[PDB]
Write a structure and sequence with these properties.
CATH topology of chain B: Acetylcholine Binding Protein, Chain: A
GO molecular function, one term (chain B): glutamate binding
Distance between the termini of chain D: 48 Å
Distance between the termini of chain B: 70 Å
CATH class of the largest domain in chain D: Mainly Beta
Membrane topology (chain B): Multi-pass membrane protein
Chains: A mainly beta (about 220), B alpha+beta (about 260), D mainly beta (about 210)
Subunit structure (chain B): Pentamer. Homooligomer, forms functional heterooligomers with glc-2.
Number of strands of chain B: 14
Structural class of chain B: alpha+beta
Number of helices of chain D: 1
CATH class of chain B: Mainly Beta
CATH architecture of the largest domain in chain D: Sandwich
Shape of chain B: elongated
Number of domains of chain D: 2
CATH superfamily of chain B: Neurotransmitter-gated ion-channel ligand-binding domain
Number of domains of chain B: 1
Strand content of chain D: over 45%
Radius of gyration of chain B: 28 Å
Protein name (chain B): Glutamate-gated chloride channel alpha
Bound molecules: ligand POV, dodecyl-beta-D-maltoside, 2-acetamido-2-deoxy-beta-D-glucopyranose, chloride ion
Number of strands of chain D: 22
Keywords (chain B): Cell membrane, Chloride, Disulfide bond, Glycoprotein, Ion channel, Ion transport, Membrane, Postsynaptic cell membrane, Signal, Synapse, Transmembrane, Transmembrane helix, Transport
Largest sheet of chain D: 7 strands, mixed
Oligomer: part of a larger assembly
Chain lengths: ~220, ~260, ~250, ~210, ~220, ~210, ~90
């Protein structure tokens, strides 16, 4: 089988510049041209450029002329992509996709890498502010209740949210982080029998290894 | 009539130096048909073979459009001398030597259809490079190709496509034309590659050549096998029969030497 | 007329001093056009019957651009083809047997084009290949047989004939080979060589078998040797005669 | 310069046949557009399917087949499987470069459709002293994962100030999402009542709050 | 020997389109070009087009530009002719005629097919109307009495007319049909001794396979 | 654009020599017209005879021979046979075209010339109820197969409302044809006399009735 | 577009027979790239070999400069027939 292992995830500040790697294996490297695809949240897949390992020839997208630079080391069978003058717009996941034909451009995608997540933002390391999310003015209780825990304003990702130090391991919902400008944020849910609360204390455990912060939050609803 | 039509086309501001217009700014699509007449002079030493063929190109130039389907004008007009139209700067990447035929009138034909479709036909004599490998002599197989692409115009301006129906047409007795080989299959594929100057569209017709095993069988393999077998029957003869065993041994070896030459 | 030569691989006009063209314009408007041309035409040839073969080469002639609606070619009514005085003898290898003028008008994807075809028929000079190869091999096989009629005890007699005949046979084969062009398919000349090579080889091998069983000195075997010699005097001439019938009836066409 | 349009999302059952289309804004999708189809499994996995003239990636099942139905590119899956459930992107070659489409979220039902359980949550007073208001509307256990979300807070129409996360695959293969609200502290007291409605499989469900 | 078997007769309605086949046998199919000739009643033999089995190249009559389309399947050794936008005018018999020269256009007809009858009428299936015809009053005897049937207004052909269920087979004459207002009309006659009429009753048997009808009619003198 | 003209029909005896001509309307028939001659046997049988430059179809008898007598093409049959009785079409090659002629109906006398047996039939009483009258003129047993049918009503030839079948061969090598006269039933009542006039080999057979 | 530019270059007094201008009167610097396609017909008797290749030369001719980088004009223009430049 073949593989396209890329570099690990990176975190940089605006103005700086880094380079993503993509080590090829399982085939004759100089025979297949490599594509590079950018996957951002706000915009769809933005194809960058391609490069022939043999020729060394490159052809970039007009949108990214100067933004990206494709090089290649035949000895280690690796393709490189350097991104210059990084801004907040360049925050995305970058893939390297192989062309399918042998020593000729067939214009079709073959194998892809696992992807490299590049996050660039001029925000500092910020501990999470945890606030107990709870039901208010509930009409009725019918043998079920849902409890929340809003983890608002932290950087960088991620956070490990558990309930009662890992005691509650069933029906625990953890939503993907949706971020405001300069601040990352997510919340969580949980499913328990209705009687065990607030007769029994539930606790939202939030840990932020980026700031070594481990805060437990009780729930106090009327 | 026809001469009057050609005049009307080139009286307007027309520039054969300018690429034909496209509906959406896309590339000019050139449909290619290929007719193979002869394959000859296959050389394994210089890695080349000679091939004579008729090239047929077709593209749309709306500037040359002079009519509708339901008019009193002839569907197509043959382009006379003294008038240049834009033509694809097509060439043969793996050609080492190539000539056009100019006896009497040169062997080109250009038709301008009413809708603006151009048909371009030309006889060409090529001497193409074909790297061959003889590790499996003589039971080997060779594949020779005829690459076709544009030289100056990149993928944004010109794009080559094999004709939908019968892209490659062999001549009546082409398979028998080759003394050494027998072609089993011909194939039409794409060989578009990315170079340091840009991405160039390219076509590749490929012929596969197999060598005649039957000769070598009856001329080398069969007689030598029998020769080796004959050398064995000296073992079944007595030692005292010196003239019998000495003759067979030497005779068999001498004959084998003659075979190799 | 935009005339050209469909099966021409290479072609030149003669331009020494003034170019060799002639155009006459008659009063009625009839035009006479004359031109000297040097062609190199393709002519697929087949050597299965080497050298008793026959080849036919052609000169196709047609218009390139103009269809049947504009131009139509016709051979002249009187003497369409004219050979030069000593053309048939000009060829070293072949002897020209027939010349013909025919039509080769064909329908193509671009239209129906009128076409003419001059055809020459070539016979190879068989007298040399007949007499310089077939005759000596025939005599060689005949000479190899008289060793059967020789006694077993005459070792210098039978050994000499067997080896000498084979050596001469190889030499004849080598001489024919240079003349013969290299071709990958089996020819008639290859069959008749390999056969004669075998008959002479078997005649020598026969001696080896005879000398062996005789040498073992016991009369059952002593006398058997002669029996082998007796049947050889009949088997070989018959088998060779059978071969010739099969050979010449196959390559008689 | 050119926009490639795909379907938002499509649903199919195992064994049946589904066709994903890929429309061009410049006109009909010709052969010089070299229609490419890319499959995206969850967890950022990308497999190649059909490309260029008639090319197929190694190992691509026979059920996958490309075509040019109408004036657009088509990806037809004849005999759909459970593992064919992913996001399918279409890429077209306009001139010198490629342009991807919105991508189609194909769902192959391995289990029957589930109605979403949605409950809105009032903003805690702990963050109200920061003059910030964040109302969270959680949506759990719905199948498939196509959920629109509208809010009727204060006046019935809403314009801006809302963000929603994509459906996340749970352990029980049912999908899950949430929708937040961005307001000031002044909005909480002034606005009358609350409403967080979500529409799934054509079925709308609303919740109340005061 | 060689053979050129074409498709069976066809019957279609205006606006439609069908395709006639012509299977060749007894020769190298790719060596001889095929012609197509249309034989209508109102007009003479009209040459349609020719096609080279090897090249696939075609040459049509200006009259049939778009009306006809010549194709060829080398594997089955068959030539095809597709007729589009069929009208009442295209109702004729179509032949395929082979050219005579080997791998060259000799411009001369060699072998022909058995023919394919294409009937294109906008008429619906109509049952025959049989009328008896007898010699008028007076002018009697003379030669032996001649009788007959009149099959008027039917569609399509053919109709089989026998006499007394096939007992009288002498003097039986079946004239070719004539279509008026898209309906065929045919008459058949017989000759019987004047002494055996009208003493012995003869009856014509008229059958129409498409209409599944079999009408008998007894002839009675005026 | 151009019309090819042949003779209507010709008659000859076995063993003798007959020549069929083929005239072009554009002028003299040259060699670039590639005169083709096609024979049509009954029951829609066709085969090529002589074509193109000087070619002959396989199996064509030696008695068939082509030429260019005068300014038109000619097909000469030297030593006519019984089976040589058919319809002969000539086709001419115009640049990018073919044009067939009317065709000549060649008759080789295999039996003595026989006069046509004509019988005319009046409209049936059942048919008159449908307001349509149909007169039928059956032409049987004549040779050669060439007849000219004319209709006359009240001493006047009718130009409209008549149609005659093409002469088809019988079982006894003779030919047969039928002619119809279509009228309204009310028209059949007013005209006292009706007549069917048939002409074969310069002689005229007449059949009439009056009701 | 391109044809619109090429004309403008050769409307001014231009001479392909004249060496391109230099900032300091120095020599014209030609950058050379070489692509070898085939090596064949190596001859040891005649001390020669046949080689087919693609030659790429590059130099700067300020006379042919038709634009600044930040304009709506294409980076490069393909030279059409009928126009000679110093080479
Ligand atoms: C033992 C028989 C030896 C023998 O016949 O070898 C014969 C092969 O011919 C055959 O072996 C054919 C099988 C018998 C000898 O072959 P040859 O005659 O040396 O073939 C060379 C002839 N040539 C130079 C014209 C190509
Ligand atoms: O034995 C000799 O074989 C050769 C074969 O070429 C014969 O030659 C004859 O037959 C061959 C057919 O194979 C013909 O091509 C040739 O034109 C003819 O001369 C001689 O007539 C005969 O004497
Ligand atoms: C031509 O023949 C080869 C060998 O049989 C085969 O692999 C190839 O697929 C053939 N070409 C095509 C396009 O069918
Ligand atoms: C001339 O050669 C041709 C070859 O086809 C042959 O048909 C013809 O009979 C020859 N003429 C004679 C009689 O020698
Ligand atoms: Cl030696």
């Amino acid at each position: 089988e073949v593989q396209l292992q890329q570099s690990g995830p990176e975190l940089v500040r605006p103005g700086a510049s880094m380079k993503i790697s993509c080590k090829a294996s399982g085939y004759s490297f100089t025979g297949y041209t490599m594509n590079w695809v950018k996957q951002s949240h706000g915009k769809n897949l933005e194809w960058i450029g391609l490069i022939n390992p043999y020729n060394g020839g490159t052809s970039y997208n007009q949108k990214f002329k100067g933004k990206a630079t494709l090089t290649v080391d035949k000895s280690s069978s690796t393709a490189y992509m350097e991104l210059l003058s990084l801004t907040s717009e360049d925050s995305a996941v970058y893939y390297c996709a192989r062309d399918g034909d042998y020593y000729r451009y067939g214009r079709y995608f073959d194998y892809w890498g696992q992807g490299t997540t590049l996050t660039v933002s001029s925000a500092k390391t910020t501990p999470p502010s945890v606030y107990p999310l709870a039901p208010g003015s509930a009409a009725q209780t019918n043998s079920m209740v849902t409890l929340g825990c809003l983890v608002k304003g932290y950087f960088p990702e991620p956070v490990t949210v558990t309930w009662n130090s890992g005691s509650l391991s069933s029906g625990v919902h953890t939503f993907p982080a949706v971020l405001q400008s300069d601040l990352y944020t997510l919340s969580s849910s949980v499913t328990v029998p209705s009687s065990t609360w607030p007769s029994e204390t539930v606790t939202c455990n939030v840990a932020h290894p980026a700031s070594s912060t481990k805060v437990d939050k009780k729930i106090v609803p009327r | 009539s026809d001469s009057k039509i050609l005049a009307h086309l080139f009286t307007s501001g027309y520039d054969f130096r300018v690429r034909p217009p496209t509906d959406n700014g896309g590339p000019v699509v050139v449909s290619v048909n290929m007719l193979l007449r002869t394959i000859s002079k296959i050389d394994v030493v210089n890695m080349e073979y000679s091939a004579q063929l008729t090239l047929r190109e077709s593209w749309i130039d709306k500037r040359l459009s002079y009519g509708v389907k339901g008019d009193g004008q002839p569907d197509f007009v043959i382009l006379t001398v003294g008038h240049q139209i834009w033509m694809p700067d097509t060439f043969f990447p793996n050609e080492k030597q190539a000539y056009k035929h100019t006896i009497d009138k040169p062997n080109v034909l250009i038709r301008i259809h009413n809708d603006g479709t151009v048909l371009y036909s030309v006889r060409i004599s090529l001497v193409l490079s074909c790297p061959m490998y003889l590790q499996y002599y003589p039971m080997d197989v060779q594949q020779c190709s005829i690459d076709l692409a544009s030289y100056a115009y990149t993928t944004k301006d010109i794009e080559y496509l094999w004709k939908e129906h019968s892209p490659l047409q062999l001549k009546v007795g082409l398979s028998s034309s080759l003394p050494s080989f027998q072609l089993t299959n011909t194939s039409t594929t794409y060989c578009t590659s990315v170079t340091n100057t840009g991405i160039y569209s390219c076509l590749r017709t490929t012929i596969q050549l197999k060598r005649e095993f039957s000769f070598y069988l009856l001329q080398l393999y069969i007689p030598s096998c029998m020769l080796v077998i004959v050398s064995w029957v000296s073992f079944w003869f007595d030692r005292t029969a010196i003239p019998a065993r000495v003759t067979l041994g030497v005779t068999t070896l001498l004959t084998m030497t003659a075979q190799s030459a | 007329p935009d005339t050209f030569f469909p099966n021409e691989k290479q072609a030149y006009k003669h331009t020494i001093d003034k170019p060799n063209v002639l155009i006459r314009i008659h009063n009625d408007g009839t035009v006479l056009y004359s031109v000297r041309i040097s062609l190199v035409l393709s002519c697929p040839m087949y050597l299965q019957y080497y050298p008793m073969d026959v080849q036919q080469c052609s000169i196709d002639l047609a218009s390139y651009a103009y269809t049947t609606k504009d131009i139509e070619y016709l051979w002249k009514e009187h003497s369409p083809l004219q050979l030069k005085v000593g053309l048939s003898s000009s060829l070293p290898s072949f002897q020209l047997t027939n010349t013909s003028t025919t039509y080769c008008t064909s329908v193509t994807n671009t239209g129906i084009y009128s076409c003419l075809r001059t055809t020459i028929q070539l016979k190879r000079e068989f007298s040399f290949y007949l007499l310089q190869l077939y005759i000596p091999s025939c005599m060689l096989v005949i000479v190899s047989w008289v060793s059967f009629w020789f006694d077993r005890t005459a070792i210098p007699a039978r050994v000499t004939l067997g080896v000498t005949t084979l050596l001469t046979m190889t030499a004849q084969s080598a001489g024919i080979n240079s003349q013969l062009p290299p071709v990958s398919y089996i020819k008639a000349i290859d069959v008749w060589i390999g056969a004669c090579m075998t008959f002479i080889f078997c005649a020598l091998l026969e001696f080896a078998l005879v000398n062996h069983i005789a040498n073992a000195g016991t009369t059952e075997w002593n006398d058997i040797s002669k029996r082998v010699d007796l049947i050889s005097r009949a088997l070989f001439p018959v088998l060779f005669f059978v071969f010739n019938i099969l050979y010449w009836s196959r390559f008689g066409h | 310069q050119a926009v490639v349009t795909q379907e938002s999302a499509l649903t199919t059952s195992p064994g049946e046949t589904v066709t994903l289309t890929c429309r061009s804004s410049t006109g009909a999708v010709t052969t010089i557009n070299f229609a490419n189809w890319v499959q995206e499994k969850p967890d950022h996995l990308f497999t190649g399917l059909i490309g260029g003239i008639n090319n197929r990636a190694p190992g691509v099942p026979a059920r996958f087949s490309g075509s040019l139905i109408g004036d657009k590119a088509a990806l037809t899956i004849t005999g759909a499987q459970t593992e064919d459930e992913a996001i399918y992107f279409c890429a077209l070659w306009y001139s010198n470069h490629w342009v991807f489409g919105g991508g189609t979220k194909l769902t192959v039902l391995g289990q029957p459709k589930s109605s979403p359980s949605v409950t809105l949550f009032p903003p805690s007073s702990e963050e109200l002293e920061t003059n910030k208001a964040t109302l969270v509307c959680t949506i759990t256990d719905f199948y498939p994962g196509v959920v629109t979300v509208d809010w009727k807070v204060d006046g019935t129409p809403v314009t801006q100030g809302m963000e929603t996360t994509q459906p996340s695959k749970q352990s029980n293969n049912k999908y899950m999402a949430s929708s937040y609200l961005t307001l000031t502290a002044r909005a909480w007291e002034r606005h009358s009542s609350y409403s967080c409605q979500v529409t799934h499989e054509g079925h709308t469900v609303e919740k109340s709050l005061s």
